[PDB]
Write a protein that holds these residues in place. Structure first.
Motif, PDB file in Angstrom:
ATOM      1  N   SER A   1       0.823  -1.199   0.000  1.00  0.00           N
ATOM      2  CA  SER A   1       0.000   0.000   0.000  1.00  0.00           C
ATOM      3  C   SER A   1       0.863   1.257   0.000  1.00  0.00           C
ATOM      4  O   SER A   1       1.975   1.273   0.534  1.00  0.00           O
ATOM      5  CB  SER A   1      -0.939   0.013   1.207  1.00  0.00           C
TER       6      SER A   1
ATOM      7  N   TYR B   1       4.254   7.197   4.785  1.00  0.00           N
ATOM      8  CA  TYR B   1       4.671   7.302   6.178  1.00  0.00           C
ATOM      9  C   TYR B   1       6.176   7.107   6.329  1.00  0.00           C
ATOM     10  O   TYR B   1       6.820   7.823   7.104  1.00  0.00           O
ATOM     11  CB  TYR B   1       3.901   6.295   7.032  1.00  0.00           C
ATOM     12  N   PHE B   2       6.755   6.147   5.599  1.00  0.00           N
ATOM     13  CA  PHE B   2       8.203   5.951   5.654  1.00  0.00           C
ATOM     14  C   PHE B   2       8.935   7.208   5.206  1.00  0.00           C
ATOM     15  O   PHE B   2       9.902   7.647   5.846  1.00  0.00           O
ATOM     16  CB  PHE B   2       8.626   4.773   4.771  1.00  0.00           C
TER      17      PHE B   2
ATOM     18  N   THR C   1       4.697  -4.848   2.479  1.00  0.00           N
ATOM     19  CA  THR C   1       3.832  -4.374   3.546  1.00  0.00           C
ATOM     20  C   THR C   1       3.062  -5.550   4.139  1.00  0.00           C
ATOM     21  O   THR C   1       3.064  -6.661   3.605  1.00  0.00           O
ATOM     22  CB  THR C   1       2.860  -3.303   3.036  1.00  0.00           C
TER      23      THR C   1
ATOM     24  N   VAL D   1       2.202  -2.235  14.563  1.00  0.00           N
ATOM     25  CA  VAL D   1       2.614  -0.967  15.204  1.00  0.00           C
ATOM     26  C   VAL D   1       2.804   0.149  14.176  1.00  0.00           C
ATOM     27  O   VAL D   1       2.125   1.171  14.336  1.00  0.00           O
ATOM     28  CB  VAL D   1       3.848  -1.235  16.093  1.00  0.00           C
TER      29      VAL D   1
HETATM   30  S1  CLF Z   1      -1.660   1.443   3.922  1.00  0.00           S
HETATM   31 FE1  CLF Z   1      -2.156   2.763   5.725  1.00  0.00          FE
HETATM   32  S2  CLF Z   1      -0.144   3.056   6.690  1.00  0.00           S
HETATM   33 FE2  CLF Z   1       0.039   1.187   5.429  1.00  0.00          FE
HETATM   34  S3  CLF Z   1      -0.213  -0.743   6.943  1.00  0.00           S
HETATM   35 FE3  CLF Z   1      -2.111  -0.027   5.667  1.00  0.00          FE
HETATM   36  S4  CLF Z   1      -3.283   1.313   7.119  1.00  0.00           S
HETATM   37 FE4  CLF Z   1      -1.096   1.271   7.783  1.00  0.00          FE
HETATM   38 FE5  CLF Z   1       1.189   0.073   8.936  1.00  0.00          FE
HETATM   39  S5  CLF Z   1       2.381  -1.562  10.325  1.00  0.00           S
HETATM   40 FE6  CLF Z   1       3.792  -0.697   8.728  1.00  0.00          FE
HETATM   41  S6  CLF Z   1       2.839   1.235   8.052  1.00  0.00           S
HETATM   42 FE7  CLF Z   1       2.051  -0.339   6.553  1.00  0.00          FE
HETATM   43  S7  CLF Z   1       3.596  -1.982   6.830  1.00  0.00           S
HETATM   44 FE8  CLF Z   1       1.622  -2.233   7.951  1.00  0.00          FE
END
Ligand code: CLF
Ligand code: ICS
Ligand SMILES: [Fe+3]
Ligand SMILES: [Fe+3]
Lengths: 522, 477, 522
Positions: free
Chosen positions: A91, A97-98, A151, B83
């Motif tokens: 996703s 976010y990274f 992911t 997390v």
């Molecule tokens: S598209 Fe959005 S930010 Fe992505 S997971 Fe999904 S709700 Fe969350 Fe979450 S812990 Fe890490 S940041 Fe992802 S790989 Fe999963």
């Protein structure tokens, strides 16, 4: 109201009388807030020891964790290779976010892509997304290599990264010879350091498992260094400088300092420096491989010993006097190059700074948290400084690392009142610093809220935060500092002693009350 | 540039994509024409992002948790799942609030279930119930719990609706389950929609039978303002100085009581149409409460919005609006006199999310600067419809722009200023172009209202005319 | 009362109830103290504008001076040469004070010697003191050369150093070939920087004046660097590193680098490093000479332009972007070596940090003081950072330097609210920061008293002290930092921005009052 010659931002503009009156009116009229006495009572209860027992009886709720997920570390590992694009299969929100996280920590551009997998891709699979994403990334951003991570959404549905990439190559979306290493990085297992380990292991497997027939240990007379998850450019720089001073041929794999310290001269460089593909292809020919952070490089260690036939030394992180000397001696034994006079002079200067500052550093009680190797190195360095660790926290640690840290503490008389916690979060640490108050806290930017809480209890209960770790968001250019080696030890010692002296100066600035100890010389 | 040149630049930029990517991206780039009132004939919006093209869009979890539900301070929001998300989204958005964090306010806190492999394999319902019990044990002063679902929760079919219902019934608490899995939708807009649906279903109608609240004919609610450094407070001071009574703020500095009291207001003042249009329409249809769009970005837009709002009430409200405008005129006139000469004629390129690309054009025009190109991360065709009117001739419009596309568009335009997010700030700073964060206000603000106009002007002046931008070339090169 | 588990130092032991009662009894019984309201009134009056007028009407009394005397700089200059013992002709209390000062600043041993002149020398002279001191020093400490400077006592009674040294060599007290350079350092003229200039002038004259017949400019293909009075080791390190990285042969005269950073290895080293006598003798053969701090090297400039026949460039101190650039171009033009790409990358990194921190740095008002060249470089860097210096003070500055600083401030829009003070002390600065309050103060450890006074006036009147300069007594290892070149620019920028952010965090840590702006990300 604003005066044009002296414009106020939110602070202290919202301290004005009209804003205060409107806030109070809104609160009383519509907020239905609990009475202030009840709030004070609840805060005081949360500062108590019964609340600490209730907090430590937790089993399913995590409050303010001190860790991240694997693909973050996978991206950080992929960033260290030459002209390499970190690719995350899953996703797009994860990639956003990274990138925001790394932009805030490094104040640098961070390049990362995703296939933008949707509900239909979650149901039918991400084969088409993988094909189109690889083709588009190669066509648009023209990298020399694409490193694929995952992911949690892809990991749950069981995406076959190997089969997907092989089919992508077979249908012509990418050239067959184009390097596309991949790694499985499930976010519900381990943490970001595990992701870094997985990505490095995957890349190493990709360039070296099918070409071990013509490899001989020690052919190139070099030493491989794997730094692990590192967010201080100074560590990479100091390791390279020390090994160059010793005259030792080295191949630092996954070196990202160049792409995270690009100059501002009018052009944007997406790629800069990085470990080359020839370096990783020639990696098995090195005399030995040294892991700087072994406690999160277990899979890499297993692969190196099993395939490259390298007898990886049992070395701790090059943090502090004893461990830096052990690292230098192991490097000298492996390479045969004696330790020169410059390193001896540096060690002597560091011991003289310790001798100078021991009178202020002794007996200080510290609470700390962070990565396993980093935390254990900091604890060791504090033990060589005469300081007393009291609360050691590692959210991503296991029983073996806890046993090692316990042995280190028991080897010293300054670890008598030290307890190690694994799997706990920063709410537990707040309870600890409220019940068993330390002098200072060493951690990342998330401890400023703990400092806020302690100040709210009182000035005599305040626990100041010393910012050493990842991520640091509220200070600028702290990622350029050094943690490893003698230079990093000097930097940490200076930071600690100056923090102690700054707190002492703050506590003694009261005129006719506490200024009798406002000494000019400290 | 001429209109024939923007199209040529668009084609030259698009020439690098493969056939499918080029054909898809050709629909998301347009040259503005304010005469056209239908944006569908020029640009295409709200489609999936092309894989591997480095998009800036987020996910539904962001659009719900970090946007709508997060600013609510008296509630506890659970990041149900692994997390990462909670950690990456913790305290990254400056939705300001007043309260004692850890006691009665939990905006900057991160509550998460921290899913492991056994949670994926066996489920998370029992763990969720235990987490709710511990939340109530350790944080007794919370006024509600929200469960924000991260991707795996949606995949493995965890039934959080029943857990929420049972735990709320047994504990007499409002527990709102939200299905904001990231893989749903294409961007944060569906997260906005899901959060609004959750508010409608589980929160809004709680006080449908309570009649204790006394309502005055001057009751308003600020809808869609999230207090990014105090913008909601700045707007509220202007609204209260008009004689109007604000009961609810959605959701910056908002409380669950304000959300419950909203259906009793006489008018809804919607700032962000994109995020809360669904809930505004639901309130209009169910309770008969009219809603209107207002803009408090720059003196002209603020004055027009105050007059439009006062036009909805009796003569006293209009008199108070005139009094406020007369009182605040000299301050913004002095701000203009100070900062317009330093900023006149400068060109601005913008790339923000769903609302701000068109809302902030008025302030830039008030300061004498022009916007040569704006773009939306996830806005629908209605937002672009409103955007064509506000933008001048031969100006570039881009949707879901890529880093490559934005880089070469800036290279060919050479704008004097760029306003975008943190994921392009350093890219364009290293190019020698002044950059302003248009999401967090570069840790400054507020920018809404007459008070915010001065800060906006000061920030633009300090960023644009900084001596550092003239020093990027070494004298020997 | 002392508890063994928690032993208290003076603070907060004297905050206890018994000590409080004892002190109150003492004050109320036998001190005849003024009433507290009178003290508060006097303090508030001292914070007023009329008190500033009276303070600036001073011409006979100096309160809290910001300078030292010449022999301190003479000793610092003499310590920069190989196996050289700084000899001080006069009283021993002066030497004790110099050693205490430099020991407190550097936390390192300092070697200096005196002839221990007494009232008998005032009656007769210091001839016998000179002879005995020279013989004893040479016998005991085995120096390669002895550099002689005078205290105020020796210069008041008009001692003749040349005749004394010639007589000492004549009667066998020291060998005739033993190099004994001398310089007159009157403490009633100038400051420590003048003493440094005089000592370097004397040493250079001794080693070069009579042997200019075989000297040809540019024979050795090297450039001479005269650093002046420097108390930052990183300055020497950065100058050497940049010159070596440029590929330029350099002769760095008066390097106290090694003697002030001796390592701890179980033995004491009186001498370490320093400029060799061969370098001093070969100096006239260099292509040119560069003065890092031209505003206190006037005598040295006159000598090198009149005797060495070197066309010394008109360069400012290499502090900040512009002046580092000009220094590098001038060095490249003199040596003929191009500027390396790594230095360009370092400059780009400095520019990147500037672009990152300009938002917080813009608009901040600074009051600073120190040595002329350092103050001017700091003012230039602040003007390039978008900060407005308001109160620029230099106790040992003259009118020409003030005019140059005024020209620099006129060159920039941020110098509009600035005013330059010469011949003023820290009481004047206290009055200024009470009347025209700046955001921060930059200076040595003597500004902590001003900060204490401002805090006593009120928290919102507090002006935090940023410790850059000399001497720094209340912080450890700040002397190892750098202020010259790009690296020093980054360190200064980081210190400034982090001090600003720390002040903002301190002002936003109050729960429910100002914590709305306690942002995690800054
Ligand atoms: S598209 Fe959005 S930010 Fe992505 S997971 Fe999904 S709700 Fe969350 Fe979450 S812990 Fe890490 S940041 Fe992802 S790989 Fe999963
Ligand atoms: S909610 Fe939306 S991206 Fe309307 S998700 Fe985003 S605090 Fe933007 S243009 Mo960040 S639709 Fe608000 C927004 Fe606008 S977070 Fe803020 S600035 S007005
Ligand atoms: Fe940067
Ligand atoms: Fe020392």
């Amino acid at each position: 109201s604003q005066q044009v010659d002296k414009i106020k931002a939110s602070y202290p503009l919202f301290l004005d009388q009209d804003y205060k009156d409107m806030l109070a009116k809104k609160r009383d009229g519509f907020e239905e807030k609990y009475p202030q006495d009840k709030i004070d009572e609840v805060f005081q209860w949360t500062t108590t020891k019964e609340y600490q027992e209730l907090n430590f009886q937790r089993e399913a709720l995590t409050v303010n964790p001190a860790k991240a997920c694997q693909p973050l570390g996978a991206v950080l590992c992929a960033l260290g290779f030459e002209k390499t694009m970190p690719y995350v299969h899953g996703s797009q929100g994860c990639v956003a976010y990274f990138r925001s996280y790394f932009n805030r920590h490094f104040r640098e551009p961070v390049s990362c892509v995703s296939d933008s997998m949707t509900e239909d891709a979650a149901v039918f699979g991400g084969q088409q997304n993988m094909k189109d994403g690889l083709q588009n990334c190669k066509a648009t951003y023209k990298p020399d290599m694409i490193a694929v991570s995952t992911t949690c959404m892809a990991e749950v549905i069981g995406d076959d990264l190997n089969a997907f990439i092989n089919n992508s190559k077979k249908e012509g979306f990418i050239p067959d010879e184009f390097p596309v290493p991949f790694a499985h990085t499930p976010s519900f297992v381990g943490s970001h350091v595990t992701g870094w380990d997985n990505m490095f292991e995957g890349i190493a497997r990709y360039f070296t498992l099918k070409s071990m027939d013509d490899k001989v240990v020690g052919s190139n007379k070099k030493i491989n260094i794997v730094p692990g998850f590192e967010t201080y450019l100074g560590n990479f720089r100091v390791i390279k400088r020390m090994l160059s001073e010793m005259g030792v041929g080295y191949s630092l794999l996954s070196d990202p300092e160049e792409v995270l310290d690009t100059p501002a001269d009018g052009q944007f460089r997406m790629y800069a420096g990085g470990t080359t593909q020839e370096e990783m292809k020639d990696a098995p020919n090195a005399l030995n491989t040294v892991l700087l952070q072994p406690w999160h490089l277990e899979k890499t260690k297993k692969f190196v010993e099993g395939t490259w036939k390298h007898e990886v030394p049992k070395l701790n992180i090059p943090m502090g006097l004893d461990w830096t000397d052990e690292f230098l001696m192991k490097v000298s034994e492996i390479s045969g190059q004696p330790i020169p006079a410059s390193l001896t002079k540096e060690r002597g200067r560091l011991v003289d700074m310790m001798t100078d500052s021991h009178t202020w550093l002794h007996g200080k009680r510290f609470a700390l948290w962070g990565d396993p190797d980093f935390v254990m190195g900091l604890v060791k360095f504090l033990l060589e400084l005469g300081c007393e660790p009291v609360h050691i926290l590692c959210h991503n640690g296991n029983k073996r690392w806890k046993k090692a840290v316990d042995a280190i503490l028991a080897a010293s008389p300054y670890g008598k009142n030290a307890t190690v916690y694994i799997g706990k979060d920063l709410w537990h640490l707040r309870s600890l610093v409220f019940t068993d108050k330390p002098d200072f806290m060493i951690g990342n930017s998330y401890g400023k809220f703990i400092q806020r809480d302690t100040l709210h209890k009182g000035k005599e209960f305040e626990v100041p935060l010393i910012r050493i770790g990842f991520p640091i968001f509220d200070r600028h250019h702290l990622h350029r500092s050094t943690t490893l080696g003698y230079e990093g030890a000097m930097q940490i010692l200076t930071t600690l002693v100056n923090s102690i002296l700054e707190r002492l100066d703050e506590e003694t600035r009261g005129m006719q009350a506490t200024d009798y100890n406002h000494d000019l010389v400290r | 540039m001429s209109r024939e040149e923007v199209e040529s630049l668009i084609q030259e930029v698009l020439e690098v994509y493969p056939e499918k990517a080029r054909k898809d991206r050709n629909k998301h780039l347009a040259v503005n024409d304010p005469a056209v009132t239908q944006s569908k004939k020029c640009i295409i919006s709200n489609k999936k992002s092309q894989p591997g093209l480095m998009t800036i869009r987020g996910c539904a979890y962001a659009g719900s948790k970090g946007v709508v539900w997060g600013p609510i301070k008296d509630m506890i929001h659970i990041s149900h799942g692994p997390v990462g998300c909670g950690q990456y989204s913790r305290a990254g958005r400056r939705n300001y609030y007043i309260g004692t964090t850890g006691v009665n306010a939990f905006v900057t806190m991160n509550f998460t279930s921290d899913f492991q492999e056994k949670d994926i394999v066996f489920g998370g319902d029992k763990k969720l119930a235990k987490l709710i019990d511990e939340v109530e044990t350790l944080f007794p002063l919370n006024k509600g719990i929200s469960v924000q679902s991260e991707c795996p929760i949606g995949l493995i079919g965890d039934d959080i609706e029943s857990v929420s219902k049972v735990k709320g019934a047994e504990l007499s608490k409002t527990i709102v389950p939200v299905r904001c899995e990231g893989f749903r939708g294409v961007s944060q807009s569906l997260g906005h929609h899901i959060a609004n649906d959750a508010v409608r279903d589980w929160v809004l109608g709680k006080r449908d039978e309570d009649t204790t609240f006394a309502s005055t004919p001057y009751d308003v609610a600020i809808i869609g303002d999230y207090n990014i450094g105090g913008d909601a407070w700045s707007s509220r001071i202007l609204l209260e100085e008009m004689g109007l009574r604000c009961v609810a703020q959605w959701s910056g500095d908002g409380s669950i009581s304000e959300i419950e009291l909203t259906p009793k207001v006489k008018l809804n003042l919607v700032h962000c149409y994109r995020s809360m249009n669904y809930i505004s329409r639901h309130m209009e249809e169910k309770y008969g409460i009219p809603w209107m769009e207002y803009n408090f970005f720059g003196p002209t837009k603020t004055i027009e919005s105050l007059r439009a709002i006062a036009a909805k009430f009796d003569e006293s409200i209009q008199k108070k609006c005139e009094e406020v405008i007369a009182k605040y005129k000299p301050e913004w006139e002095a701000v203009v006199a100070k900062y317009r000469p330093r900023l006149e004629g400068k060109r601005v390129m913008l790339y923000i999310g769903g609302l701000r690309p068109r809302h902030v054009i008025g302030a830039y025009e008030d300061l004498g600067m022009e916007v040569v190109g704006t773009g939306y991360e996830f806005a629908h065709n209605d937002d672009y419809d409103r955007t064509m009117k506000e933008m001048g001739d031969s100006t570039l419009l881009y949707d879901d722009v890529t880093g490559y596309e934005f880089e070469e568009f800036v290279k060919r335009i050479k704008p004097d200023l760029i306003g975008s997010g943190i994921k392009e700030k350093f890219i364009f700073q290293k190019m020698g172009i002044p950059f302003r964060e248009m999401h967090s206000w570069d840790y400054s603000g507020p920018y809404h209202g007459f008070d915010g106009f001065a800060i906006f002007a000061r920030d633009m002046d300090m960023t644009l005319n900084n001596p550092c931008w003239k020093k990027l070339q070494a004298p020997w090169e």
